[PDB]
Each structure stands twice: as C-alpha cells, then as structure tokens.
C-alpha cells in the first residue's frame, strides 16, 4: 500500500483559565508533519518532518488561516455542545476530531474518515459512503440535521476525494526516502536471572519504522502469548519506534526459547535465541 493522512483536532475548554485551547496535529502514516497550538507565542502551522519544510509561504499562511478559523469554530462548538447537554460553564470539556484519507498502492482513495468525540465518547461520524452521518446520541442528531441541511457531507466528500488525496501523493513523493523506505528493527535478546531457578528473556526491537510489528516468543513451538509480557510500541523520539517482549523461563530451558520478529522492513522473518 499503504497509505494514510490524518489530522487530529483537540479543543479543550478551561473555565477561568482563558479561552479554550485548540491543538491540531497532522500525520502521514506513522509520521507527524504539521502542528498548530493556539497557546503558542504566535499561532502558526509549523513543520514537524524534514520533507514538509520545503513548502512555500502560501502553504503555511494558508494553513495558519484555516487553523485559526477552525480554532474559533470549535470554540463556538464547545459553547453549543454545552447547551445540547445542559451543562454548566464551570466544567472543562473536550471536542476531538480526526479525519483523513487512505489510498491504495495506485494512489486511488480507498477510504475517507471524519469522526468527532465529545468528552471522549463518539459524537458524530461520516459514513464510508461519504454521504451520510452516524450520530451517537440525540444531541448529535441536532448536529446531524444541521450538516444535512448545510450539505456538509458533500463538501467533505470533495475534500477527501480531491485535496486530501492530491496532497498525500505529494507528501509521499517528497518524503519517499523515509515514508516509503522501511526501517528494519535492530534486534537482540537479553538474559537476566531473577532467582537461581528462573530467568527473564527479553526480545528487543529498536529504531524501526513503520510502527507495526509482531514480536512473539516460542518454546520448541508453539506460542507463549499468555505468558509473554509485551509492552505497547513506543516512540524513540527520533521518528522511529521501540518494542520488547519478555518471558519468564525456568533455569535450564533458555535454549528451547526462540524470539520471532515480523516487520515490513525485514525481507525475511527473524528468529533469535539468547547467546
């Protein structure tokens, strides 16, 4: 494939501590490329990856313009939601939005998304037909009817099918040496005695991209999933990812245990033992 572009808006009210904060991040697959924070010294859409910095003033001014209008829209939306749910102006509330497009290997739109949450529950969502909405409650039904009336789905369909797909094509080309070039994990097994009778085996995958990875332990075959301590994949802080999988083994059994790594960047699946 792959491939995807996503924007994540967070609009948070903070009564008595100024106006709501608005934060927007843009991703292409597992890589952040743009950010916007209404609490910055001078609000602007800023680059987050090396391949986007090559954009011109018009791109940045244009995006900053769009984010400032969105910030205000979602400031209004917070006031609106407060009357839909009949809540006080004393409490902090949150709107989240995520939208974007997925394209196949040929660059054709596979799937578009546009979802909203209020206080962390699904609020309203664009259906895959890109023409109707699913509303989670009767308050979202009010919003739904407004968007049917305003033909919001038709405007958003055109964005997902046009601009969103066109720009992802540009981004994928401009960042092809990282976004389309896969980073295999560096791997190694460590051995730490717990007691005289037990030892931990930990399998490491470091500096890999994309984030997707499978890391399993086996004992002569087959899987030891229900006994493996697996940490959630984590960012290294340099655009790449980290993961480990641990298993507590009886002393004398360490040679029966194999680690197995699956990742797009590896041409062949890895088998590792402690040495």
């Amino acid at each position: 494939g792959s491939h995807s572009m996503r924007y994540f808006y967070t609009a948070m009210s903070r009564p008595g501590r100024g106006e709501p904060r608005f934060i927007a991040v843009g991703y292409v697959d597992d890589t952040q490329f743009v950010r916007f924070d209404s609490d910055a010294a001078s609000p602007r859409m800023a680059p987050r990856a090396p391949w986007i910095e090559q954009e011109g003033p018009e791109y940045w001014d244009g995006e900053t313009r769009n984010m400032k209008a969105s910030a205000q829209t979602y400031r209004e939306n917070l006031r609106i939601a407060l009357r839909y749910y009949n809540q006080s102006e004393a409490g902090s509330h949150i709107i989240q939005v995520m939208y974007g497009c997925d394209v196949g290997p040929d660059g054709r739109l596979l799937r578009g998304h546009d979802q909203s949450a209020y206080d962390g529950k699904d609020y309203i969502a664009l259906n895959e037909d890109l023409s109707s909405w699913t509303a989670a409650d009767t308050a979202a039904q009010i919003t739904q009817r407004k968007w049917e009336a305003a033909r919001v789905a038709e405007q958003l369909r055109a964005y997902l099918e046009g601009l969103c797909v066109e720009w992802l094509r540009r981004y994928l080309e401009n960042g092809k040496e990282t976004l389309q070039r896969a980073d295999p994990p560096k791997t190694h097994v460590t051995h730490h005695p717990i007691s005289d009778h037990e030892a931990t085996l930990r399998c490491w995958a470091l500096g890999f991209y994309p984030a997707e990875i499978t890391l399993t332990w086996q004992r002569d075959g087959e899987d030891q999933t229900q006994d493996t301590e697996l940490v959630e994949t984590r960012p290294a802080g340099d655009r790449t990812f980290q993961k480990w999988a641990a298993v507590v083994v009886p002393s004398g059994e360490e040679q029966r245990y194999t680690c197995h790594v699956q990742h797009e960047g590896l041409p062949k699946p890895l088998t590792l033992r402690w040495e």
């Binding site: 924007y7 927007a24 843009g26 791109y59 995006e63 769009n66 984010m67 209008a69 969105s70 829209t73 209004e76 939306n77 609106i80 939601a81 839909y84 939005v97 939208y99 909203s116 009010i142 919003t143 407004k146 968007w147 919001v152 405007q155 958003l156 964005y159 601009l163 969103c164 066109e166 720009w167």
Partner: peptide, 9 residues
C-alpha cells in the same frame, strides 16, 4: 492539507 470545510455544531 487540512479541510477548508466548516463544521459548526
């Protein structure tokens, strides 16, 4: 590029 589509509730 973000969406220019106003989503008012």
């Amino acid at each position: 590029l973000s969406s220019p589509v106003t989503k008012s509730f």
